[PDB]
Amino acid sequence: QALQKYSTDLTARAREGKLDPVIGRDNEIRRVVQVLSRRTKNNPVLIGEPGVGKTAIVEGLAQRIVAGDVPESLRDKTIVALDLGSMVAGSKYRGEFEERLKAVLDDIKNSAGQIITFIDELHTIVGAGADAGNMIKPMLARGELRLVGATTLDEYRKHIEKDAALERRFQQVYVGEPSVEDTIGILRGLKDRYEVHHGVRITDSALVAAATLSDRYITARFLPDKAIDLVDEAASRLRMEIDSRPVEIDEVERLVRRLEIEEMALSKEEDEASAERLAKLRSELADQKEKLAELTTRWQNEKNAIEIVRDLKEQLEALRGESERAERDGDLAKAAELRYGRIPEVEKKLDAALPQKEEVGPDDIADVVSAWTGIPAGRLLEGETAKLLRMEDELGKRVIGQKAAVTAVSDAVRRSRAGVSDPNRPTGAFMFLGPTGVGKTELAKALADFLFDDERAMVRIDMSEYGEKHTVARLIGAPPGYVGYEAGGQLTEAVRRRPYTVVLFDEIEKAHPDVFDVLLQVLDEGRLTDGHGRTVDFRNTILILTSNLGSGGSAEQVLAAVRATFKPEFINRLDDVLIFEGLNPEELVRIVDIQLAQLGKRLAQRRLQLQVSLPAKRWLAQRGFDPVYGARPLRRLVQQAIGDQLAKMLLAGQVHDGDTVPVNVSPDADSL
Amino acid sequence: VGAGATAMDAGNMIKPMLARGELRLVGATTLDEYRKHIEKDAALERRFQQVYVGEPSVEDTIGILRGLKDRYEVHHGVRITDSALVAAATL
Amino acid sequence: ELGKRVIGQKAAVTAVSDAVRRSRAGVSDPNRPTGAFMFLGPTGVGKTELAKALADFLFDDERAMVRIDMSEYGEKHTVARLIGAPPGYVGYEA
Ligand SMILES: Nc1ncnc2c1ncn2[C@@H]1O[C@H](COP(=O)(O)OP(=O)(O)OP(O)(O)=S)[C@@H](O)[C@H]1O
Ligand SMILES: Nc1ncnc2c1ncn2[C@@H]1O[C@H](COP(=O)(O)OP(=O)(O)OP(O)(O)=S)[C@@H](O)[C@H]1O
Ligand SMILES: Nc1ncnc2c1ncn2[C@@H]1O[C@H](COP(=O)(O)OP(=O)(O)OP(O)(O)=S)[C@@H](O)[C@H]1O
């Protein structure tokens, strides 16, 4: 009777149907049984990575015993769940724990096999000492107490295989992880258990996506655990949407309810600097209050348009009663008039009346796997499509020219959002090289802005420091048992948290030609492993490789120089190698505008503008010279001409805030 | 992880109750230790869902300050101008 | 059947196939790996695709082949990455 204090009853719990269904895994259950019912040393231990299903098999065996599908050698037997935790609770006196464990052991032995002790997490049995988990070695080798355990695959070799005197008494049962085709079946069986918990309904076209999708994105965790969670969270989110107002009607309202308070408290400031701040927040407040009511009206357009059709469905039901009564009265004329007329016509009408949010679908799964792990996998929800359609106009605001590159960098993004690219390869990995000062670094910074709205959220590594072959370990971590090892890589451990950034290998031709060979398998597979032995997936980034090879050759004095610097096995991995071209005098008059815009923006910190005249605005370009240093010298000329005397004046009085000074071309130089 | 040791016995007594969702256990830990202590014990990490929290920008820090610009203004017997908030959030 | 994923290179598909039946028939030597041979040739021919096709013919899941890339093991001290660490060092329980 000591077991009533230190153990619960798995089989009794399964009798009232308080466990979950168990599907598949016939070989494993049959092996567990046929090992559990032998003469001596009859005690299995399940094993395998955490998440694959190892307690579900014991629970399935319990349900199977309650059913009666096991042979006579096992029919009518109770499985007890031992608990080493609740036995060492109060045992401060020198024999309490030994006494308790002895009582439990003798009470199990006293039965005739009516009891099967099932320890979960049995790797905890090595402790309890202070001669503990050692008084069970006698009874184990004789098969008296049946033991059933479950420990993850890599604490076994850490807590048990140390004690081979013990792991001899145990029979191993390897539990391999399932595949998608059987995870589909497991989900199809489990659906109803969550359908009742969350008062919603779940589509099978969604149970398929919750497994096909969660196998190529969330690669850190194992099968089953990583496909049930999407379903559960999606159902919970849909229930939240059902109860209160839906999302995207909630975020806008919340943020407006804050902008209001902000502008209210900003209205009572006694300054002129805040006067332009109150005059900008007051515009976004209106811009957002517009969309709130627009989306609010769009909500009723669907809430009541479908709602009017509810009477017609009931009307369709009324038509079915009408056909019933037509056939009651012998009204053949109405029988078909309802069967082929009214009822089917109202049915086509009602099919047309269907607006679209009352059951999870193959898109809420994508929404959850996008909120988690950050990788965008959706359907281009009507706002992203318009923006993606004009990108070479959105990148053109920072880069000027280079349509050769902007028509290819922005190409591997569209055909990746449209669900067409290869599923296991980087979204794009191409190296573009050309003369200096053209913008080959500015493009990979203008692009990263277009996605995350932050030019610094990308992983940038400078490949001019890797001048020695031994400096590779900086980005791949150091092998175990060395100085810096519990720090991992630096390239690797930076992508394992946000697998969406755009990595940028800057100035690649300077690195010693073995960093190339390390890079060789990053392309074409998107995988590498740091010291700890963790594979990291690069199948979503955009690998970009700057360079300065050739340096002046037209096309065959550089394309014959990169061939003699890289190997074919490496050049073959990349996508098309882009060639940048120099700057014509025409396409510099716009860089002038961009530079002056940036300068004025930086001078907005003092409420200080400045006017510019087209003569000087084109004289700057006319002194944009020497198509051998690109568009860099213009950046020095601007601050030699304008900013120099502007700063010499700004600290000598005669210029203050709110002012404005126009530049005008003196016969040779610029005079304010 | 290492609640009470001596040979692992404690700190995983809640590992069974976590799975059935008995307790809810919201917690917050830094980022360069979740892979130094927990990730090493992937049997337990499996029961945790991660909610990555990125750093905000200046435009949102300005709002956070504009909302928090009362507790300090009270604790110290002074007043604070919004220009100070903007200049601080920039510098 | 290997001809469904790899094309040509019958000279290699034969010598790969004749290394599995020679172990099923209980004939090959019992003290040597069940077959250990090296591919080499020009790039982009299949020398990596054939290993994947073979590793799927036997398990029906391409991810079930232990795979290590020899492009990182550039120095002696990295050998300990595939053998563990000597007794009493930093990473020893791994
Ligand atoms: N064959 C299966 N049939 C039904 N549900 C399953 C099956 N395999 C796994 N599950 C579910 O997936 C989850 C896996 O839970 P467990 O198998 O208990 O985890 P585990 O395999 O014990 O790994 P550890 O070591 O205990 S963390 C649970 O929610 C199970 O209900
Ligand atoms: N085509 C261009 N479009 C826009 N800005 C440009 C262009 N060319 C140069 N610039 C400006 O000059 C700088 C860009 O130079 P970078 O691209 O960083 O140098 P680079 O192109 O990497 O050449 P190297 O080989 O690295 S010195 C920025 O300040 C840009 O504003
Ligand atoms: N003989 C082939 N049959 C089918 N596909 C092939 C063949 N050769 C190459 N491929 C394709 O090319 C890719 C595989 O290239 P591989 O030749 O396996 O690379 P590799 O063998 O490692 O050569 P290197 O020198 O290491 S780059 C896949 O996309 C295949 O579809």
Write the layout of secondary structure elements.
The structure is cut from a larger assembly and holds 3 copies of chain A.
Chain A: H1 3-6, E1 7-9, H2 10-15, H3 26-36, E2 44-48, H4 56-67, E3 78-82, H5 96-110, E4 115-118, H6 137-140, E5 146-152, H7 153-159, H8 164-167, E6 171-174, H9 180-197, H10 204-212, H11 225-243, H12 251-266, H13 273-303, H14 305-328, H15 332-353, H16 364-371, H17 384-389, H18 403-409, H19 411-417, E7 428-433, H20 442-452, E8 460-462, H21 492-495, E9 504-506, H22 515-519, E10 527-529, E11 535-537, E12 542-545, H23 568-571, E13 578-579, H24 589-602, E14 609-612, H25 614-622, H26 633-650, E15 660-665, E16 670-671
Parallel strand pairs in A: 2-5, 2-6, 3-4, 4-5, 7-12, 7-13, 8-9, 9-12, 14-15
Antiparallel strand pairs in A: 1-3, 10-11, 15-16
Bound molecules: phosphothiophosphoric acid-adenylate ester (3 copies).
PDB class: chaperone
Keywords: ClpB-DnaK complex, protein aggregates, Unfold, Refold, chaperone
Entry title: The Mycobacterium tuberculosis ClpB disaggregase hexamer structure with three locally refined ClpB middle domains and three DnaK nucleotide binding domains
